Ligand binder design. Structure first.
Ligand SMILES: *[C@@H]1O[C@H](CO)[C@@H](O)[C@H](O)[C@H]1NC(C)=O
Length: 498
């Protein structure tokens, strides 16, 4: 019944974790071999495997003794004793955890058998981002490829999935062999893949549990009401993550993502064009992700590009994964909806008063919100030139409204257009002033002293304050375009002299 075997994995692991010779290597081999066979039953295969393991271990102890006796630290003995005890227990076929462990095994095995694919992908991603190298690049790339394939509608038949599991299993087997076999080799650098013996001493256990889940899976394979607003928020958060990416890993590449998000904010029907441009965003995201992972290796002889992609830590990649999953979900939704529309067209071939009241209230009382946003934009932090130009525009608008009011009714939308244009220019200028040539290019082109130039807001920020310096004007632009698109013309036709 509750006749377990994982105890043998446990003791084989603790036995191979501290002794390193040709004697423990076979113990590690058999440890790797355990998760392939079933639990002990009325069977001959697992029985003979166990019995041969015990024979080999006892004989190895005997060989150690017959070596040490010739005269013309031996925890392996206790391991052999435990192995023989388990052999006898199998031949036979206060206390709180007895059934607890059984329940744990049962529910975890059922968790594997239901949706093992996604947990394998999660393990692949974790192993990839754990310790970057050329070897872990295999795991990371197959992770990324599987996630991209799932993002598309194209599915996968289980036999190819199983052969991929077999390939990855033998690959991680060889990887663990190299890892726990390296304690003899004599090298320190000129080779990326591994190192010698959580920062980097927690990877082998992750690879081991990965291989164990893969082994259970392959063993299984050989037993022959408001969710619309939620979709809206989904594409919105995908866009905002696309924007926020270009702040963490500042480079002349992700500037295209930032400018794309900016130019996508200011469009009439943004959902349609966002869904259209979704796949390109996904492919570009994962491409620059591969570039990130490559240039985040262990070795400093890569000669990072000065203005473009540069050198980063391994930890600063999970945030990029969190960004890319938004693109993946966006593409999934877009493709599903497009397929539904296509099959539909193939098949063919009490609260209103609240809405009216609130839309009228916004038509009449939103220009004041846009005006009040000027103060929040211009009166935060230090005082610089562009924050003064903002107030200059605001005061000019108010003065022109007070003076004539006939021109002010004709030159209103042009004001908002100029405002959003100026905000875009401010974004571009404050973003580009973070490279290396620019802080000197401004002087060499237009000679101004360092602080005299910095007084215009241009300075070297940190990864925190730049979020503010980008989003505050971004929020202002968003509010302004929201006013311009929906409420402007209705407001202008509301208050007029007929
Ligand atoms: C400023 O930088 C440029 C970069 O090409 C270089 O010619 C020189 O260092 C300076 N040029 C000036 C001062 O015009």
């Amino acid at each position: 019944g509750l006749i377990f075997r994982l105890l043998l994995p446990i003791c084989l692991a603790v036995a191979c974790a501290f002794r390193y010779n040709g004697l423990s290597f076979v113990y590690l081999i058999y440890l790797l071999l355990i998760p392939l066979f079933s639990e002990p039953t009325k069977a001959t295969m697992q029985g003979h495997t166990g019995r041969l393991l015990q024979s080999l271990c006892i004989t190895s102890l005997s060989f150690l003794l017959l070596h040490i006796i010739f005269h013309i630290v031996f925890v392996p003995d206790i391991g052999m004793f435990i192995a023989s005890l388990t052999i006898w227990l199998v031949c036979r076929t206060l206390r709180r955890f007895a059934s607890v462990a059984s329940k744990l095994k049962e529910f975890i095995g059922n968790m594997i058998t239901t949706a093992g694919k996604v947990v394998v992908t999660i393990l692949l991603g974790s192993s990839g981002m754990m310790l970057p190298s050329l070897t872990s690049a295999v795991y990371f790339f197959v992770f990324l490829g599987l996630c991209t394939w799932w993002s598309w509608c194209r599915t996968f038949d289980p036999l190819l999935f199983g052969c991929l599991c077999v390939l990855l299993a033998i690959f991680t087997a060889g990887h663990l062999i190299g890892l726990y076999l390296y304690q003899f080799q004599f090298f320190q650098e000129a080779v990326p893949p591994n190192d010698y013996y959580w920062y980097h001493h927690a990877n082998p256990i992750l690879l081991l549990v990965m291989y164990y889940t893969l082994a259970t899976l392959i063993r299984i394979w050989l037993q022959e009401a408001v969710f619309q607003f939620i979709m809206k928020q989904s594409y919105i958060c995908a866009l905002i993550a696309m924007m926020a990416w270009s702040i963490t890993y500042h480079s002349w590449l992700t500037f295209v993502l930032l400018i794309w998000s900016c130019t996508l904010w200011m469009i009439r029907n943004r959902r349609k064009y966002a869904m259209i441009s979704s796949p390109f965003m996904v492919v570009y995201a994962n491409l620059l992700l591969v570039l990130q992972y490559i240039w985040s290796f262990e070795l400093p002889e890569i000669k990072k590009v000065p203005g473009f992609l540069e050198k980063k830590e391994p930890g600063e990649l999970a945030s990029k994964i969190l960004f890319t999953i938004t693109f993946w979900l966006l593409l999934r939704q877009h493709l599903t909806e497009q397929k539904a529309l296509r099959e539909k067209e193939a098949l063919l071939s009490i609260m209103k008063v609240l809405g009216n009241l609130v839309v009228a209230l916004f038509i009449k009382y939103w220009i004041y919100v846009c005006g009040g946003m000027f103060f929040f934009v211009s009166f935060e932090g230090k005082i610089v030139m562009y924050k003064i130009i903002y107030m200059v525009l605001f005061l000019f608008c108010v003065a022109l409204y007070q003076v004539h009011y006939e021109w002010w009714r004709k030159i209103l939308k042009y004001f908002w257009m100029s405002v959003v244009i100026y905000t875009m220019l401010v974004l571009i200028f404050i973003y580009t002033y973070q490279f290396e040539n620019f802080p000197g290019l401004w002087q060499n082109m237009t000679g101004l002293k360092k602080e005299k130039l910095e007084d215009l807001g241009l300075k070297q920020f940190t990864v925190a304050e730049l979020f503010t310096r980008i989003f505050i004007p971004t929020s202002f632009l968003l509010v302004c375009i929201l006013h311009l698109h929906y409420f402007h013309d209705r407001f202008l036709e509301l208050t007029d002299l007929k």
